[PDB]
Amino acid sequence: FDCAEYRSTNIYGYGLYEVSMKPAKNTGIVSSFFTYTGPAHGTQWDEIDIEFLGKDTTKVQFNYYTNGVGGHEKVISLGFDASKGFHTYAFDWQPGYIKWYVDGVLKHTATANIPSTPGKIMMNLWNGTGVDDWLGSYNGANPLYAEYDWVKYTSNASTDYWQNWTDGGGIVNAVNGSGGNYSVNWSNTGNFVVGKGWTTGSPFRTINYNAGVWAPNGNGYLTLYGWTRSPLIEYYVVDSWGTYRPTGTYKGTVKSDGGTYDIYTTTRYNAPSIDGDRTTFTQYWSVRQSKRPTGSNATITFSNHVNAWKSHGMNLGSNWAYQVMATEGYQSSGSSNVTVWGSVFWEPKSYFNPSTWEKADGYSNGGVFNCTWRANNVNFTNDGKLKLGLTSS
Amino acid sequence: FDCAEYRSTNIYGYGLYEVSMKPAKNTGIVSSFFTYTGPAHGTQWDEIDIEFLGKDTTKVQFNYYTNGVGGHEKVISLGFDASKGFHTYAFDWQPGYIKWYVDGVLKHTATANIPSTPGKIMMNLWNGTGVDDWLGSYNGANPLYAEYDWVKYTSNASTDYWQNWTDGGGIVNAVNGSGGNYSVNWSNTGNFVVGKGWTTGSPFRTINYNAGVWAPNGNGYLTLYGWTRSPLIEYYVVDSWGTYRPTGTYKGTVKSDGGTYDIYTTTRYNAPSIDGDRTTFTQYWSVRQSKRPTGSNATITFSNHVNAWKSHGMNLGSNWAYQVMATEGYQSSGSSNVTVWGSVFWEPKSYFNPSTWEKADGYSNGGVFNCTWRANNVNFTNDGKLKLGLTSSA
Numbered sequence A: 001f002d003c004a005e006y007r008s009t010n011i012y013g014y015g016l017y018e019v020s021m022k023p024a025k026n027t028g029i030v031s032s033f034f035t036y037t038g039p040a041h042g043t044q045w046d047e048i049d050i051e052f053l054g055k056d057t058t059k060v061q062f063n064y065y066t067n068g069v070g071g072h073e074k075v076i077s078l079g080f081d082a083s084k085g086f087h088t089y090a091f092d093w094q095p096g097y098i099k100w101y102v103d104g105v106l107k108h109t110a111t112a113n114i115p116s117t118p119g120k121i122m123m124n125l126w127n128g129t130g131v132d133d134w135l136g137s138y139n140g141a142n143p144l145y146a147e148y149d150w151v152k153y154t155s156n157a158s159t160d161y162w163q164n165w166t167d168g169g170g171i172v173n174a175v176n177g178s179g180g181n182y183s184v185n186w187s188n189t190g191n192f193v194v195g196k197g198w199t200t201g202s203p204f205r206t207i208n209y210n211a212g213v214w215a216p217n218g219n220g221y222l223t224l225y226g227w228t229r230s231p232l233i234e235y236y237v238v239d240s241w242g243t244y245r246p247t248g249t250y251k252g253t254v255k256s257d258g259g260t261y262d263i264y265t266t267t268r269y270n271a272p273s274i275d276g277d278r279t280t281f282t283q284y285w286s287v288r289q290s291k292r293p294t295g296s297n298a299t300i301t302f303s304n305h306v307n308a309w310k311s312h313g314m315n316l317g318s319n320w321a322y323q324v325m326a327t328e329g330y331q332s333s334g335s336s337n338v339t340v341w342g343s344v345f346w347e348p349k350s351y352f353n354p355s356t357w358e359k360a361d362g363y364s365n366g367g368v369f370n371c372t373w374r375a376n377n378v379n380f381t382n383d384g385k386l387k388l389g390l391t392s393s
Numbered sequence B: 001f002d003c004a005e006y007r008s009t010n011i012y013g014y015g016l017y018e019v020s021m022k023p024a025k026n027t028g029i030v031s032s033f034f035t036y037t038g039p040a041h042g043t044q045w046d047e048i049d050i051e052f053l054g055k056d057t058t059k060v061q062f063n064y065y066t067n068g069v070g071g072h073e074k075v076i077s078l079g080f081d082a083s084k085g086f087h088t089y090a091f092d093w094q095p096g097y098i099k100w101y102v103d104g105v106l107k108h109t110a111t112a113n114i115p116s117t118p119g120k121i122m123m124n125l126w127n128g129t130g131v132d133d134w135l136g137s138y139n140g141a142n143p144l145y146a147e148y149d150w151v152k153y154t155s156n157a158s159t160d161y162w163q164n165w166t167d168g169g170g171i172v173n174a175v176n177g178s179g180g181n182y183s184v185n186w187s188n189t190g191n192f193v194v195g196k197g198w199t200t201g202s203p204f205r206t207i208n209y210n211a212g213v214w215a216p217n218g219n220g221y222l223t224l225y226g227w228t229r230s231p232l233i234e235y236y237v238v239d240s241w242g243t244y245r246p247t248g249t250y251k252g253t254v255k256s257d258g259g260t261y262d263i264y265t266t267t268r269y270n271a272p273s274i275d276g277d278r279t280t281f282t283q284y285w286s287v288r289q290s291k292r293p294t295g296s297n298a299t300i301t302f303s304n305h306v307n308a309w310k311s312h313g314m315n316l317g318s319n320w321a322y323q324v325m326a327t328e329g330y331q332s333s334g335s336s337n338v339t340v341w342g343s344v345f346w347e348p349k350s351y352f353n354p355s356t357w358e359k360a361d362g363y364s365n366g367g368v369f370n371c372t373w374r375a376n377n378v379n380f381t382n383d384g385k386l387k388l389g390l391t392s393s394a
């Protein structure tokens, strides 16, 4: 028996691992997506799994090994047959937990003896021997296939600041979420500003976020927000908004991260600021000429804005205070869900890219794996999908 | 009684510590500014003090504890009542000594068994018991408060180069002072360049200095000065001068650290340079459009100049030689006194900053400290002063 394993050439650490896949269906096999490192690579055996036991594809199995100790199996009922269509499975791996998801919904959290060694991303399909109680016995049916549409890994941002300010009008339910994530649900408010970011901003920072939810019902801004002191200046890089587009005195424009922004300035007197709730300071703005798409990864190269501002005579303070990816609102209702992240590894799997992936070939895992890995069983379909096969002879 | 103590979250080492404050006046209390490290910070007890005994606010007491041993009290007459206005008190803490100052005047020096363990910066007000001969008896007067307008700590410069070059004309009395400080007194000279700085310059250095004395009597420059090789270039950032403002071939201007400078290029031939007594080289200049005030702190963000020079096609060499904060002179007389500083921790005390400070709360030091620390007694005024109160009851 011949089986298939596709594995990354690089190693990856803590962060969110997502895959879109359709597992094979048959007694005695497994289709999976997992991270792995072990003794053959000079490390302890640290692995995090997503496994579909072909005997019953209406279930998914989650597991993990740390220093070679597994025993963390959690089987969950899916509510659909995973073999009948593509679905997104994922696990967020951090030092104190692992959270697994199905089509974006949280289904299981683990906290005991979590792995810590960066591993490779892997995907395999195989038939077992000696584990009939676990997989059912394999009946030789072939060929069988497991398909994967895309793989994505996003590393941590290291945001250290949480901002949750409301003027007291209406309701602002802000949620300080895990890592760089936050969400806000608001109802008929006065003014507020909620966001995650950094305690000390920087003119060189590159902010990467994703707004999984951007649904202002009225005046809301999805915006890089921060301050400087010496002098006191509040700045904004607005990517999207609600029913009102912020403007002021026009200075010019700046092209950055695929968008063009209008640059403005506005002055403020007697309003809440970081140096006291009744002060006098300017606001610097970059406002996108049209709302940025949300729901996907977006980058704000803050230095291009700082520089274009410098160029139009707008210079910032030298005492840098907080810097966040915010949701601000006024006299409105809405929801927002935003994640600030570190870096993304994106693989569309449209074909075999030999710099970032390798096809296991010419050897068997032995043990319960009753098959040899073959690069010939790792192919790409026309519609740009990884197709893993289990064949015989 | 409830009392107050405000202390830094970070620890600080050798360097100059200054505070602008006005202690409370009353028999029985102490208002202070001091560095502290001890058992509760996991170390030996090292502390340096500035204490105002409320029984007599015309005097100030200096002390220090090293490995839990004190006994170095020194009381000096201020010549004024400390409780009537703000004054600046400081101590310069170095490996081999401590120097204390009042309004910038040296008042006391110690050298024996100098503390060496970095500690927190602290301020407190408290009333004692059992030490009436030292503090007087505390009569319960209340409420009382000590005020502090700002705190500043400046670390050491780590300048590793002393410049003292004269062509031999007239007299150049250069003084290699402590740390980054130097002075020069000169009379009817030829050309000379004196200063302190670094053996290897950097396009990224930020120079903090202060010219305590800037009194050229003729042609003299107060300037950042340095060279590169590959190619050989002499560069200046001139902040002040005497009777002659240096100029050359005009390129443009750069705004930096609050001033605007004119950018110039010039060429020198058959003149001395770090490469020979007779050489030819290029000079790059930034010259302030008007003289920079002296006597108060000044900063030169050198990368602003390097970057503007690059804009105009003035690229520096790749092998960096010395870089100093200099006094240069030609055919003149005069005096200068300049100090290059290290990095600064500046706290204007405009409000509570929980990242760099904490309020002592819910416990008493006990012993002589007849009061409980309360975070509620550490407040900030509208006008940016820290107010540490001593209050009665519950």
Ligand SMILES: [Ca+2]
Binding pocket: A148, A149, A150, A348, A349, A350, A383, A384, A385, A386
């Ligand atoms: Ca695909």
Ligand SMILES: [Ca+2]
Binding pocket: B148, B149, B150, B348, B349, B350, B383, B384, B385
């Ligand atoms: Ca102040």
